[PDB]
Amino acid sequence: VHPGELDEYYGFWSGGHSGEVRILGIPSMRELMRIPVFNIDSATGWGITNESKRIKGDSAHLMTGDSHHPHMSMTDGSYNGKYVFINDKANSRVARIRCDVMKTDKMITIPNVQAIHGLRVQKVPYTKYVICNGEFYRSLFNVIDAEKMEVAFQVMVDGNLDNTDADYDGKYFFSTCYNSERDHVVVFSLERCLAALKAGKFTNYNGNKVPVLDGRKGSDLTRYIPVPKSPHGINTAPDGKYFVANGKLSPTVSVVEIARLDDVFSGKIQPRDAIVAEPELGLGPLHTAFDNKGNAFTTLFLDSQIAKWNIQDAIKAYNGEKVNYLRQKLDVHYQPGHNHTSQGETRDTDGKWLVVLCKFSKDRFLPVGPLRPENDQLIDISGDEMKLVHDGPTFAEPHDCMIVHRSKVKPQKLWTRDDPMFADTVAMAKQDGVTLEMDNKVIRDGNKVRVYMTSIAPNFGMNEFKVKLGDEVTVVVTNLDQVEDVTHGFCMTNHGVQMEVAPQATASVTFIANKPGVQWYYCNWFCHMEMRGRMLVEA
Amino acid sequence: VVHPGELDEYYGFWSGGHSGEVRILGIPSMRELMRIPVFNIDSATGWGITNESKRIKGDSAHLMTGDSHHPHMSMTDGSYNGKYVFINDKANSRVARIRCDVMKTDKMITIPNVQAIHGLRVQKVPYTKYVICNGEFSLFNVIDAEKMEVAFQVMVDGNLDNTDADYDGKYFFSTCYNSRDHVVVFSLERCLAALKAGKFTNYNGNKVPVLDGRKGSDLTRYIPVPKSPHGINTAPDGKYFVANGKLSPTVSVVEIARLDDVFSGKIQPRDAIVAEPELGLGPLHTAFDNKGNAFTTLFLDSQIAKWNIQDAIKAYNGEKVNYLRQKLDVHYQPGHNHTSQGETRDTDGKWLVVLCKFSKDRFLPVGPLRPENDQLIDISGDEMKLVHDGPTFAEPHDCMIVHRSKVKPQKLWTRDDPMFADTVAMAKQDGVTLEMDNKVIRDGNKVRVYMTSIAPNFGMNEFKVKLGDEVTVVVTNLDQVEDVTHGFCMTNHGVQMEVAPQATASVTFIANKPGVQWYYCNWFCHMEMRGRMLVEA
């Protein structure tokens, strides 16, 4: 990607422990934007603005989180560009990002659980539900309503749940049990789950209304396919025909044929009969991604490699044929966890790019101290041979990523005044008699002051206001510029308050006027230089 | 082109801008290798939340944000020594020191008498004894690099913008954006003289020495420069500085040798100037190669102008000569630019980096918030060539490029490190030896819990607290291999922290939440590292 040329895909990377989501240019691998979710963001005021606190809700007091599995919504198994879903492994939260504006717009705490592993989206007919694994010793599969951001129901299971995926028919979800020689993949029949809901075969644990179903062994709702051993990843192939459970402690992967699952649910066949391959690949197989020619790419954590293999040949070998299913092994640097192909989790898998997330970079970059970056490696798989083309230092241990063709995402260039994200601020303003598109007013409410001001580069609509020492001050800034990329900032000097105000947005922030005398506020973002003003704090 | 297996030639220290951090970049890759938290609350490392970082932030530990402005590395003597990086928080009147051995912020001060801080540079020669910055009361601040305390302040007329230093240790310089305006020149020798002679005032409840550098004073000389000048940049031969015209289409070149005679009264302030070349609309900032050329950002024109300094001197004295060598479009609205080792005697003329404020069409769209564009230009050959377009987050104001040989960080922490010394001292008063103990100490409604970690285990499986107890967790990573960072994460309490090999970190929270509460090693250290805090009603 020379200068002047554009990337072909957007990458949505997990921020890991940074609590953000990152947008990347694929194949350049350059970071284009950071979207704050679970962190406190100095740049935007996310965590500190009243709008962001409202979105955070009950968890607004949390300052950190571990951004885990980012997935984008689909319509019938292709990305639709609408939302990106992400979980906080550390605090039992799932967040939704709206891709028109690239900001987090909803966040929920999942009830009845102390941790959240694994998040994926329903593929087909479209993303109605988001699924993830919870724990409290025992496990709960969670089905969340994507558009409502509410928990629909949960299914209690035998075992401890790890990763999840979904099929390409809308009938089934599945998850790996990391603990119960064999472990299992639990398969969830959605039809049967929804039936059981209408019948009223459910419980609520104390202090909530989330309906909990019984999906333990011998339930109608679930079948347990045995698989070795403490498996990790579970990955659906882009033809809808198989899924792969990744051995981890065992040097294999088990391939299951989704068409057989009905027969397992009827008792027409036994759970083991779902499995149609068990190819030995190498030590520590964690995660499998797929191309468009029926090959798979599996990360070998202990071996530090990617194994390319062919799924039809593996099925043939499990039936005693002499065919080589392993195509190639490629060293990676070092300790690969997850890997993802370009549009890989969808029907549009194009077989161009494989990304590998390696946990230890070692000698691969300049030394920068005891805290070291991870390595994200870009692999050209478009040809017969896999080829390592780029090493991407990466911060705070991203767990997972997602790659979408640019044609499927179309962000806004400006906010719109009716956006739900600052609707409640607009509501508050209306209560005070204030029209945000034209007014610069100060409202006095007891020991509170709300200060409504507009900004048009190169100045604020209010030169100054006067408050008392001690007063709780709320500042509502509306950026009335109508030109793309003309972000304004509001910074109240020496109070540790700053926030971006994008074109057409309103933002607000609340602080105590603790310091007496003339305080300066200004436009911190390049919006000029006059954008300046004074808060006179009186003794 | 840095291929897989090849390493970058230089480290870049990039301003975090409004992110409040410093970024470490590989040059010429332009890959972000690390983020050093400074003025921000960092979720990944716990910086801003841990007791160690709160101690370093001091009187500003309540602030949750800032705008990290000018990163500059220490020198000996006109050459980077890799020891420290200094950086200011424009928004909150703070300066911070990063130790490059550990790549962490080790000191932070709030500067007195000042309501905001703009420029920051390091003394070059004989070594980085002082760090200099500009404050609005305006005040010139001289900070003791090593001690991180303000040595003295100098009151001037007009409003200070950017600053630089000479290559002899005699003179500091600053632009005034408000009162032709001026560049104030400060004589260090005469400033130190006046300190010793007691010719200084104090303010308020600080005892910071404040000297008079207003017009007419012995300490300062005001050189007139058009118009609301921005950048002030010292050429790498030490002979000139350039003040950047901004509103005026020019740069002014002052000859540093002439400044003694300006201070003596032998020549006039205006006689300092030896070239005023016209370059283009909006000249903001200049960088230098190692062949006599300068590279100036033209903001309104959106270009870089390469010109020659000696030819501009010749043209100023009537000669019929062409000083302007090339103009280059950049994309778009160039603010600052820096050359590889450019602000030192080691300037190598390999690479120019340009910070442009508007991406517009250069990257995939990503919403109403757009990245800025950091453009890498190859300046080795005759003409300048654009080789790379670097999206950057949150408006980086400034950067510096240092050769990798001059930086040499630690692989591990050491137990005596002053960054956890007071924790170590607190553990000692509790009778605790951090390299071996897993203990719980009870004190009123305080609880101190000391634990060790060796992958894949915490030394303490579980402990018991009452509801509402104030709990400090001190974790010591005892692995001895590089790159085996651990984390401590107490689930559902919004507490996480990195614990690098041999380091100690502590975090204090209230146990608000009854019942079993899991903590674990969030960072890949795995997978057993788990443990239970039992909170009892």
Every domain of chain A and the residues it spans:
1-422, 423-539
| Consecutive H or E run containing A356 | strand A353-358
Q: DSSP label at A354?
A: E
Of B41, B104, B369, the CB nearest to A102: B369
Q: DSSP label at B158?
A: S
Q: Report which residue type is found at B499.
A: V
Of B62, B116, B368, the CB nearest to A412: B368
Radius of gyration of chain B, Cα coordinates, nearest whole angstrom = 26
Minimum distance, in Å, between the CA of residue A55 and any CA atom of chain B: 16
Q: Report which residue type is found at A386.
A: M
Q: Is A20 annotated as a binding residue?
A: no
Find residues 113-132 of chain B whose CB sits inside 8 Å of chain A.
115-116
CATH code for A1-422? Answer: 2.130.10.10
Residue A512: CB atoms within 10 Å = 13
Per CB-CB distance under 8 Å, the chain B contacts of A286 are: none
User: If DSSP codes are grouped into helix, strand and coil, which group holds residue B209?
Assistant: coil
Minimum distance, in Å, between the CA of residue A171 and any CA atom of chain B: 33
Q: What is the residue-wise DSSP string for B96-112? A: EEEETTTTEEEEEEEPT
**With an 8 Å Cβ cutoff, are A414 and B368 in contact?**
yes
B59 close to A496: Cβ distance less than 8 angstroms? no
In angstroms, the CA B291 to CA A479 distance is 47
What torsion, rounded to 10 degrees, do the Cα atoms B477, B480, B484, B489 define?
A: -10
The architecture of the domain spanning B421-537 is: Sandwich (2.60)
B155 close to B139: Cβ distance less than 8 angstroms? yes
| Consecutive H or E run containing A466 | strand A464-468
φ/ψ of A365, rounded to 5, equals: -135, 170
- C-to-N gaps above 2.5 Å in chain B, after residues: 137, 179, 525
Per CB-CB distance under 8 Å, the chain B contacts of A389 are: 4
In total, chain B counts a number of residues equal to 537
Per CB-CB distance under 8 Å, the chain A contacts of B411 are: 367, 370
The runs of H, that is alpha helices, within B140-231 are 188-196
Which is it for strands A353-358 and A374-380: parallel, antiparallel or unpaired? antiparallel
Q: Is A399 annotated as a binding residue?
A: yes
Method of determination used here: X-ray
Going by the annotation, the residues of the binding site of B for Cu cation are 69-70, 118, 230, 285, 336, 397, 486, 521, 523, 525-526, 529
Provide CB contacts within 8 A for A305, sequence distance 6+: A282, A299, A329, A330, A331, A332, A336
Q: Return the HEC string of B288-312.
A: ECCCCEEEEEECCCCEEEEEEHHHH
What torsion, rounded to 10 degrees, do the Cα atoms B232, B235, B238, B241 define?
A: -30
Q: DSSP label at A49?
A: S
Per CB-CB distance under 8 Å, the chain A contacts of B33 are: 365-366, 368, 373, 393
**With an 8 Å Cβ cutoff, are B391 and A30 in contact?**
yes
Tell me, yes or no, if B524 comes closer than 8 A to chain A by beta carbon.
yes
In angstroms, the CA B246 to CA B283 distance is 5
| Consecutive H or E run containing A109 | strand A103-109
The runs of H, that is alpha helices, within A249-291 are 261-266
**With an 8 Å Cβ cutoff, are A90 and B491 in contact?**
yes
User: If DSSP codes are grouped into helix, strand and coil, which group holds residue B53?
Assistant: helix
B14 close to B71: Cβ distance less than 8 angstroms? yes
**With an 8 Å Cβ cutoff, are B371 and A32 in contact?**
yes
Q: For A392, which residue in chain B has the nearest alpha carbon?
A: B31
Of B369, B390, B500, the CB nearest to A370: B500
In angstroms, the CA A395 to CA A374 distance is 6
In angstroms, the CA A230 to CA A160 distance is 10
In which residue are the tokens 């490629």 written? A330
- Per-residue buried b or exposed e for B138-167, using 16+ beta carbons within 10 Å of the residue's own CB: bbbbbbebbebebbbbbbbbbbbbbbbbbb
| Consecutive H or E run containing B81 | strand B80-89
In angstroms, the CA B144 to CA A168 distance is 66
Which is it for strands B283-288 and A234-236: parallel, antiparallel or unpaired? unpaired
B174 close to B184: Cβ distance less than 8 angstroms? yes
Tell me, yes or no, if A61 comes closer than 8 A to chain B by beta carbon.
yes
Token pair, residue B297, equals 């950002």
Token pair, residue B172, equals 């500091």
Per CB-CB distance under 8 Å, the chain B contacts of A484 are: 360, 368, 370
Of B4, B44, B523, the CB nearest to A391: B4
φ/ψ of B260, rounded to 5, equals: -55, -50
A292 close to A314: Cβ distance less than 8 angstroms? no
Angstrom CA distances, B330 to A161, B176, B265, B296, stand at 52, 27, 44, 12
| Consecutive H or E run containing B490 | strand B486-490
**With an 8 Å Cβ cutoff, are B522 and A412 in contact?**
no
A80 close to A147: Cβ distance less than 8 angstroms? no
Task: Judge residue A359's burial from the number of C-beta atoms within 10 Å of its C-beta, 0-12 exposed, 13-18 middle, 19 or more buried.
Answer: middle
Q: DSSP label at B17?
A: B
User: If DSSP codes are grouped into helix, strand and coil, which group holds residue B384?
Assistant: coil
Q: How far apart are the first and last CA of chain A?
A: 59
Radius of gyration of chain A, Cα coordinates, nearest whole angstrom = 26
Per CB-CB distance under 8 Å, the chain B contacts of A491 are: 67, 91
Which segments within A194-335 are labelled E, that is strand? 212-214, 222-227, 234-236, 242-246, 253-257, 275-277, 285-290, 295-300, 305-310, 326-331
**With an 8 Å Cβ cutoff, are B487 and A17 in contact?**
yes
Task: Judge residue A482's burial from the number of C-beta atoms within 10 Å of its C-beta, 0-12 exposed, 13-18 middle, 19 or more buried.
Answer: exposed
Q: Is A340 annotated as a binding residue?
A: no
B348 close to B340: Cβ distance less than 8 angstroms? yes
Per CB-CB distance under 8 Å, the chain A contacts of B30 are: 30
B35 close to B16: Cβ distance less than 8 angstroms? yes
Which is it for strands A285-290 and A295-300: parallel, antiparallel or unpaired? antiparallel
Long-range contacts from A272-276, C-beta under 8 angstroms, 24+ separation: A272/A225, A272/A226, A274/A225, A275/A225, A275/A227, A276/A242, A276/A315, A276/A318
Find residues 302-361 of chain A whose CB sits inside 8 Å of chain B.
333, 335, 359-361
Tell me, yes or no, if A43 comes closer than 8 A to chain B by beta carbon.
yes
In total, chain A counts a number of residues equal to 539
Provide CB contacts within 8 A for B21, sequence distance 6+: A42, B35, B36, B37, B38, B39, B40, B42, B68
In angstroms, the CA B440 to CA A475 distance is 45
Find residues 379-418 of chain A whose CB sits inside 8 Å of chain B.
388-393, 395-397, 406, 410-415
Of B26, B103, B496, the CB nearest to A90: B496
The architecture of the domain spanning A423-539 is: Sandwich (2.60)
B353 close to B344: Cβ distance less than 8 angstroms? no
Which is it for strands B220-225 and B210-212: parallel, antiparallel or unpaired? unpaired
Q: For A10, which residue in chain B has the nearest alpha carbon?
A: B364
Per CB-CB distance under 8 Å, the chain A contacts of B90 are: 524
B390 close to A2: Cβ distance less than 8 angstroms? no
In angstroms, the CA A424 to CA A403 distance is 34
The resolution in Å comes to 2.1
* Nearest Cα residue to B71 out of B2, B146, B149, B11: B11
CB pairs under 8 A between A and B: 288
Angstrom CA distances, A325 to A27, A247, A275, A316, stand at 29, 17, 17, 9
Find residues 129-158 of chain A whose CB sits inside 8 Å of chain B.
none
Q: For A101, which residue in chain B has the nearest alpha carbon?
A: B367
Q: What is the residue-wise DSSP string for A195-216? A: HHHHHT--B--TT----EEE-S
Tell me, yes or no, if A466 comes closer than 8 A to chain B by beta carbon.
no
Cα B386 from chain centroid (whole Å): 26
Mutate to test the interface with B, among A371, A377, A492 (most CBs of B within 10 A): A371
CA angle B448, B452, B457 (to 5 degrees): 125
Q: For A26, which residue in chain B has the nearest alpha carbon?
A: B364
**With an 8 Å Cβ cutoff, are B359 and A485 in contact?**
yes
B85 close to B98: Cβ distance less than 8 angstroms? yes
Provide CB contacts within 8 A for A433, sequence distance 6+: none
* Nearest Cα residue to B343 out of B231, B236, B232, B230: B236
In angstroms, the CA B202 to CA A369 distance is 41
Q: DSSP label at B362?
A: S
Tell me, yes or no, if A68 comes closer than 8 A to chain B by beta carbon.
no
Cα B175 from chain centroid (whole Å): 20
Token pair, residue A225, equals 């396919």
In angstroms, the CA A392 to CA A304 distance is 17
Fold (CATH) for B1-420: Methylamine Dehydrogenase; Chain H (2.130.10)
CA angle A354, A360, A362 (to 5 degrees): 115
Minimum distance, in Å, between the CA of residue A288 and any CA atom of chain B: 20
In angstroms, the CA B32 to CA B29 distance is 9
Q: Return the HEC string of B167-183.
A: CCCCEEEEEEEECCEEE
Tell me, yes or no, if A442 comes closer than 8 A to chain B by beta carbon.
no
Mutate to test the interface with B, among A110, A366, A409 (most CBs of B within 10 A): A366
Cα B37 from chain centroid (whole Å): 11
Cα A112 from chain centroid (whole Å): 21
Residue B428: CB atoms within 10 Å = 11
Mutate to test the interface with B, among A42, A138, A354, A359 (most CBs of B within 10 A): A42
- Per-residue buried b or exposed e for B269-304, using 16+ beta carbons within 10 Å of the residue's own CB: beebbbbbbbbbebbbbbbbbbeebbbbbbbebbbb
User: If DSSP codes are grouped into helix, strand and coil, which group holds residue B57?
Assistant: helix
**CA quadruple A496, A500, A504, A507: dihedral sign:** negative
In angstroms, the CA B267 to CA B353 distance is 38
Q: DSSP label at B156?
A: -
B325 close to B293: Cβ distance less than 8 angstroms? yes
Of A19, A368, A485, the CB nearest to B409: A368
Tell me, yes or no, if B482 comes closer than 8 A to chain A by beta carbon.
yes
Q: Phi-psi category of A266—alpha, beta or left, where left has phi over 0 and alpha has psi -120 to 50?
A: alpha
